[PDB]
Amino acid sequence: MTHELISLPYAVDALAPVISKETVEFHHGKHLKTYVDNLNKLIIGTEFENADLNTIVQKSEGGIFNNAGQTLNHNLYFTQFRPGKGGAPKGKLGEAIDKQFGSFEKFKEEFNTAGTTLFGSGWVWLASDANGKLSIEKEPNAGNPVRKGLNPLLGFDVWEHAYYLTYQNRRADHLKDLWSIVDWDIVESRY
């Protein structure tokens, strides 16, 4: 079986200046493309050869997991952003964030802090369980909450390639700027 490189729902420069055209090209066209190609080559002749992506992330180990996890991570990452959006979440998700975190602003800083204190490469995930309970997951390297049976809602990539060309060492500034391009209509639909 074969996994495909996702098509971006927007132009490569649609997310500037928070995510530059150059970053999109490298992040999507080089990094993600590599994870997809690796995954495809590594699952041949294995029990994951014909499994759906989520099943692979939940059960694989080693190189297969690293590539499958990164593939799922970026697929979700790239499709949750849209220019001219941002703002705050409404409806179901919006209510749960206030109840569990007190307010959207309070949740944002906890999210940002989680992403900033994650040492090295990794991901910060907003996830939920079957009951709708929200949690903030700090996932080192290729980690994803589906491995814990959780539902990944919003993920911020803190691997340096996600922001280096524009922010260099200023990861904190990048995380606070990312909220401006989050399409909550897409995120709410994952809840």
Residues engaged in binding its own copies (CB under 8 A): 13-18, 20, 26, 30-31, 34, 66, 83-84, 86-87, 119-122, 140-142, 159-161, 164-170, 173-174, 176-177, 180-181
**Nearest distance in Å: CB 61, Fe ion:** 20
Which CB atom, from 79 or from 100, has the smaller least distance to Fe ion? 79
Helix (H) or strand (E) holding 155: strand 151-157
* From its own copies, Fe ion, none, interface partner of 157 (C-beta below 5 to 8 A by class): Fe ion
The amino acid at residue 134 is L
Contacts with Fe ion, 142-181, as mask; x by CB under 5 A:
---------------x-x--x-------------------
The annotation status of 174 as a binding-site residue, yes or no, is no
Q: Do residues 184 and 85 lie in contact, with contact meaning Cβ atoms separated by under 8 Å?
A: yes
Which CB atom, from 128 or from 155, has the smaller least distance to its own copies? 155
Under DSSP, the state recorded for 183 is -
Which CB atom, from 53 or from 172, has the smaller least distance to its own copies? 172
Name 66's Cβ contacts closer than 8 Å, sequence gap at least 6.
Answer: 141, 142
* From its own copies, Fe ion, none, interface partner of 165 (C-beta below 5 to 8 A by class): its own copies
Q: Mark 59-73 as b/e (b = at least 16 C-beta within 10 Å).
A: ebeeebbbbbbbbbb
Tokens 């996890």 sit at which residue? 69
Q: Mark 15-53 as b/e (b = at least 16 C-beta within 10 Å).
A: bbebbbeebbebbbeebbeebbebbbebbeeeebeebeb
**Nearest distance in Å: CB 74, Fe ion:** 6
Which CB atom, from 100 or from 141, has the smaller least distance to its own copies? 141
